[PDB]
Design a protein around this ligand. Sequence first.
Ligand SMILES: NS(=O)(=O)c1c(F)c(F)c(S(=O)(=O)CCc2ccccc2)c(NCc2ccccc2)c1F
Ligand SMILES: NS(=O)(=O)c1c(F)c(F)c(S(=O)(=O)CCc2ccccc2)c(NCc2ccccc2)c1F
Ligand SMILES: [Zn+2]
Ligand SMILES: [Zn+2]
Lengths: 260, 261
Amino acid sequence: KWTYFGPDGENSWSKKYPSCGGLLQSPIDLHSDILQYDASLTPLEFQGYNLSANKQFLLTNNGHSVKLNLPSDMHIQGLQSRYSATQLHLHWGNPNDPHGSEHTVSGQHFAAELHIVHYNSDLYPDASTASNKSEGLAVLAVLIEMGSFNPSYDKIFSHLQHVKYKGQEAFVPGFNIEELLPERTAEYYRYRGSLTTPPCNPTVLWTVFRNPVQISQEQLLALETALYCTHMDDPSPREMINNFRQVQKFDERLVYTSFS
Amino acid sequence: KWTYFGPDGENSWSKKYPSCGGLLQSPIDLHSDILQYDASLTPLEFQGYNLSANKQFLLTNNGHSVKLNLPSDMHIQGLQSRYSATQLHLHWGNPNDPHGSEHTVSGQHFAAELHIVHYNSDLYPDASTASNKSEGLAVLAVLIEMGSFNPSYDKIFSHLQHVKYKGQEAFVPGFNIEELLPERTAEYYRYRGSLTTPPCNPTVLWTVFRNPVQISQEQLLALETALYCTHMDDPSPREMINNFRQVQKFDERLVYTSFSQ
Ligand SMILES: NS(=O)(=O)c1c(F)c(F)c(S(=O)(=O)CCc2ccccc2)c(NCc2ccccc2)c1F
Ligand SMILES: NS(=O)(=O)c1c(F)c(F)c(S(=O)(=O)CCc2ccccc2)c(NCc2ccccc2)c1F
Ligand SMILES: [Zn+2]
Ligand SMILES: [Zn+2]
């Protein structure tokens, strides 16, 4: 199965997953030469993000990240179609080099990155169907850096030891997912791109917020050391670290910004 | 065949050239978390770099870059062995985003990058043989930024209009190749990596100098606009631009430096 290191690592994805060597690949480096202010871009509105604490949502180690399943009643407004949530998950680096965001800003990697994945529910019945179809997916990306302890991110991180191996799952009580978002969400970069993992479908409208959120060094280290890519019975266990793709070429493409 | 853009672009090199998906790939981002000072890293001694101005050296557009053939009497001493020069060539971006070095520093891409390719002539008969062998190659990299005109790089750049197309050649009179090197060559990053083009052999000892050189905006725009990947006869020409590979993962690996900060 594909990985982020060794023979089946990212430079090999295109062998089995052609789109990984096709058009509109993500992530990218967000830098002045490719940015253009677009005054018509409007603030997103997050609806249904405040999940009932009496409900529960599945957290799964899928062998590539840790993901939290999200209900289709959670959605975003401010795009041309309604997009409804399906899951969120994270990318991170490793304790020797704690810089594993997927997007970079002026060449700099943040410690980690949160993706909140939505599908076009106006056009499509579910994420699976949406994922390889035009306009299918909208992902929100939050850059994460070291700093103060984040009680909100801890509503995910405190359950990590129950999902250490691939295929393991744990239910998490609902909490307000808006608490994972940064300050001033109105300021963001927006561009057409792709899944940043196989099958790399070029069907994602990306919004990356301008402002990072902070988690503590202890939180980041927990995220970096908690998880394995492999099933509990794999003869060759692999730690889940550096699960972020290198940035892609972005030529002639432009990234639009909601801030000037 | 292979390119830097489209279906034959870098995410697909590993399909034809399996080492491009292997270990020890270059180029990389040089950033403090992966740097360690190594005081045993001594000055390279450049020898035979002051090339004869009575001799001419072949410049070629090989459809991926522009390369200048170098003589085997040019070498660097310092390494476990003598490494003898074989060619130099460049990598660059395009005028809309003039940032096409291959190595980056704390995420900064530079405008362009010069590579001076050498092979271990002590152990191996030529660079072809050496390129499959552990540490068989040594490549010196000079980061290039946009700034002052550089009369020495112009010894090469003044010839670009006779090599506009794949397969075309020009002669360049010898000049002192040390003049293409930056200030304080003693200061460099060193690591074990690969050819940054197919076949991506993990056989290169990298030396990237700490300090960049400058060329002019005009020189940079000539380098970015003068050259084509395609033959003269080709009705669908492709500009030779953005001929640099993206940085590669570099985990469990360290880059050693001959300077401390
Ligand atoms: N980092 S990302 O946001 O672009 C991303 C992918 F790159 C990606 F490939 C996928 S997926 O098709 O492989 C599904 C599994 C997955 C989950 C988390 C990280 C990597 C892979 C998802 N997932 C979103 C999704 C949901 C339903 C159907 C299709 C895609 C995904 F969210
Ligand atoms: N980035 S690089 O320094 O590692 C590099 C190039 F970028 C490059 F374009 C070349 S190339 O001009 O020679 C064409 C690609 C190639 C590379 C190796 C073998 C066949 C074709 C070499 N070339 C290194 C080299 C020089 C002489 C003999 C063998 C290899 C090369 F080493
Ligand atoms: Zn993701
Ligand atoms: Zn090169």
